[PDB]
Design a protein around this ligand. Structure first.
Ligand SMILES: N[C@@H](CCCC[NH3+])C(=O)O
Ligand SMILES: N[C@@H](CCCC[NH3+])C(=O)O
Ligand SMILES: N[C@@H](CCCC[NH3+])C(=O)O
Ligand SMILES: N[C@@H](CCCC[NH3+])C(=O)O
Ligand code: NA
Ligand code: NA
Ligand code: NA
Ligand code: NA
Lengths: 313, 308, 312, 312
């Protein structure tokens, strides 16, 4: 219980957690060299944790053997330099139990657990689901009703918070929901890049589980550590708007290809933003400055035929 | 003529998947449920739909259950595999295996949780539309993404697009049927009006799991607002928690499925099970599946399984 | 009485083809090519098929592929041929699961090998078979050259007490065949070059055959029309060619040369070399092309026609 | 340079334990029991562990169990012992995926058997091994008693051209061991009852051991402190008892009797009978309980203490 306590507190103290993009080879297999370069770039620019195969990491498109491999690989290669949080959540309790116990057995520092999506359940069912995995180790509960189509209500979060393994909540409902939890001492990470500044400084959020940190990790570190900076927050808004004009991770996948740090390979059902938006992206990089974005290569527009779409991989 | 056989079906049951106490499929109980559907005029079955808890299956057990259903019943009923996924890879592999097992058609949802652009949604459906007769499934209450009319009209030009399982409501159903697209209502409490007022071919039904004879009557024997009003309390009871919590609880009370739930589903509470006994008596037990007297059951009768 | 006839339906089969699983260029199943192979077997008097046996590369399938191929075969051909799923495993857990799923697909029977690589005690071997023998008609497969463990007579005799034990696919030789057939146990020879003598001199019911993949008509003649030392001697050069490397290397090469399977190998199998493919053209000319499956002129094929897949 | 160092780090190991995988009463892995077994090996001078080898029942594992156990062993013990994953398979697809996943998760080496049951040609064996050898330090496993196919010297000589081929786990005997060691190829004996003479008289580097599961200190002494024919002779009755039925039946029974694993077997393995367990208690007394793993007095155990799992 003393080790469990320290383990949970080591997650609660994290302010910058990157929902890391999973890059691919031309045949659709994981590009582990590109992935390792992405994680090293996050560490060098002050990311304190990584979600492995989150929504941004396309965990939804992995086989369990790929997903478990990427968790174990990240622990083995980077576990001493960053906290590794496996997205071992599922709409199936059986899948969540097996994936979470395997992830913890291979040394991941915490688990991200969404409520069941598509196959939505009752409040009693939601509690039953979370109770099967909460005992296994430090857990972040993920409320994203725009994707799950089911709000995790405060009554569920308050009951789960009775368990010392509940590290906190990745909250997407907004700053009023954030404040309801943080005023009661529950740790909250904003899941909304365009709200995380106000969440952090005005509503008691500990930090952010970020998509945008994939592109500008240094600026997101600054936003979470160095106090209110409404000017920097305003300067990042056009980039955050561009990143979410189509569902995540279409934007981050397109951007990382343009910056030359991931191959222009998409696993279906994702397809890149079209030419006009890629031209907009080069303009956004020029306005902020290329030096703030990951990678060293000059940003490219890329041609339509540079992109590879993989269904069977 | 494969696709035209699907297009003529008016009663398609989203069949419940029953379990043994260790959480494995109860294939004996499953066969008994499908046989009862065939005897009471069900014309098709969705295997591992939302009601069938496909979302809780391994692909191993989902494709097995499709193959089992084709072997046992394929000559007596149209077998539509729910081979859809939020992952294009999973949808491709499940659909080609389902068609290889001999299923008559596929049900395909738009990607849920990992939602995509219109262009990505089109790309997803195109990987599976060429494999055989396909019903497109629109349920924005569960996917949190409406398949817009623009997409359905474009998909409907593909001769393998049988039609739409539509859950938006009767205005959406009518927008499609008036433009010659075949529509099954996905909403039991709307399907009567859908069928008789809005050009729906029929229903892909949860309630037919409980009262298959009454649902066939509702789709075939003409407009009957009195029979429809008679079923509304039962339909309201079945959807007070998300499907399939209601049907799982009801089939346990009727004795045709064991009171075994795969998590994250748990039964309706005692007060609702007491109300179910009253709903059965009001409609008449003879109209519900099974021969056993309806039991309330104790909370401690229900087995909740996470590890199966 | 209901189960008795299902097992008796298997016991009466004389020609069971261990059917080859053909592939498309990236290593996925070629179901069109497979269906054509099975139809050819039926048309030429094969009475059963083993789905994903040693010849069918069941050892290279995932269980989802293997159970799909069984269900596909039952649905498409189950009324025209007896479908025996190779649902055996060196893991009891895998054998139980695969056998249950196979019978749920409607397969007529199961083929069960003793545990290979992870060999066990006589008591362990009996425990293994007892978990699956109750599920339906079962053929017990003894192939000590592959398993490195003989299923001894004492085990076959104990298994024989269960009515679901249809018989034995025996590879030890015609002396072991006779030890069983003289006690009323049904035996299929698993050795194409012994099956004639097994059938006519040692009371074997018939063969579970590799060679029937190429010349199903001639293997049917061999098992049905009586003693024919001339026909048996005529087939021996083809049988020697098919088993010069471990099965199914020969049959995979031959079916590609005859144009009824694509020249796609799942590793760790690779084709016979050009010298053997030239010999095969000569063997076909000597027997006559009309006796071999397919209508295309037999080809040698270039080394570069053969696609070797690891990531299947 | 890092690859040369990683390979040399495997080549220097003299005592590698083929660690037993212990189970909970329902058949799932007992990770608490496993962690205690690995700790005991480290404390008594084991330098490497095979995860899910023949002894570890890799043959009865699902891949998710097998990969988890490799990743768990690296995470908990990888700084204190070399972790060699048994990521081999008779299927090249299984071997490729398991091996790349095991190396991605930080295993130090891979153990690769030639394809068993589905045996292939020499050319096929080479093609199989070439798909995995480039992925990291590799021990080639020759056990013709289980595979029913000798990996011939020409295959080992060819693989030894690759800087990732660490060496050979050889079971054919001391003549084959010497054909490799005389050329500077690293060999571990796979035969506990030969490994003493193999180490001191035939140039073997050490042993990949079953017996080290029971007496790790005595096996370390045998591999490091020079010829000791007396100690080797003192161990022979124990080694004879451990292999009277196929491994791991003996080690599974012994570890239950020493109280360091539950008396739980995955089929098709079943324990040695009562008379053999009585013989074990006598063997432990003659050698001395202090040399065997665990602190608890050795127990005979009753027949009904043992649990046999089919659906694990
Ligand atoms: N596509 C499925 C399976 C993903 C499994 C690996 N995370 C889902 O989103 O639930
Ligand atoms: N739970 C996953 C996998 C189900 C796969 C079998 N239908 C999902 O809902 O996407
Ligand atoms: N390669 C494994 C798995 C095959 C499973 C499908 N038959 C074996 O030969 O046991
Ligand atoms: N029982 C199969 C599969 C084992 C997979 C895990 N090592 C075999 O021995 O090949
Ligand atoms: Na995430
Ligand atoms: Na459905
Ligand atoms: Na066979
Ligand atoms: Na080993």
């Amino acid at each position: 219980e003393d080790k469990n306590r320290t383990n949970t507190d080591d997650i609660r103290s994290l302010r910058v957690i990157t929902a890391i993009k999973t890059p691919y080879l031309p045949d659709g297999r994981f590009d582990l060299q590109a992935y390792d370069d992405l994680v090293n770039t996050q560490i060098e620019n002050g990311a304190e944790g990584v979600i492995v195969g989150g929504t941004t990491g396309e965990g939804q498109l992995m086989s369990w053997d790929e997903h478990i491999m990427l968790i174990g690989h990240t622990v083995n290669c980077f576990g001493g330099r960053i906290k590794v949080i496996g997205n071992t959540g599922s709409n199936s309790t059986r899948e969540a139990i097996h994936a979470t116990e395997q992830g913890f057995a291979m040394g991941m520092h915490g688990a991200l657990h969404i409520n069941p999506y598509y196959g939505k359940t009752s409040i009693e069912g939601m509690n039953a689901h979370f109770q099967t995995v909460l005992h296994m180790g430090p857990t972040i509960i993920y409320n994203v009703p725009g994707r799950t189509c089911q709000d995790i209500p405060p009554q569920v979060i308050f009951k789960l918070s009775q368990n010392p393994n509940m590290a906190g909540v990745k909250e997407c409902v907004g700053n009023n929901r954030v404040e309801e939890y943080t005023e009661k001492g529950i740790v909250v990470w904003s899941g909304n890049d365009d709200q995380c500044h106000d969440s952090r400084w005005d509503h008691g959020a500990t930090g952010v589980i970020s998509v945008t940190s994939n592109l500008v990790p240094g600026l997101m570190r600054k936003l979470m550590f160095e106090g209110r900076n409404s000017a920097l927050n305003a300067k990042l808004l056009p980039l955050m708007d561009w990143l979410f004009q189509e569902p995540n991770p279409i934007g981050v996948n397109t951007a990382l290809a343009q910056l030359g740090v991931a191959r222009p390979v998409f696993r279906l059902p994702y397809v890149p933003l079209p030419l006009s938006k890629r031209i907009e992206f080069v303009k956004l990089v020029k306005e902020i400055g290329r030096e703030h974005f990951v990678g060293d290569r000059d940003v490219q527009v890329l041609d339509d035929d540079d992109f590879i779409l993989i269904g069977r991989y």
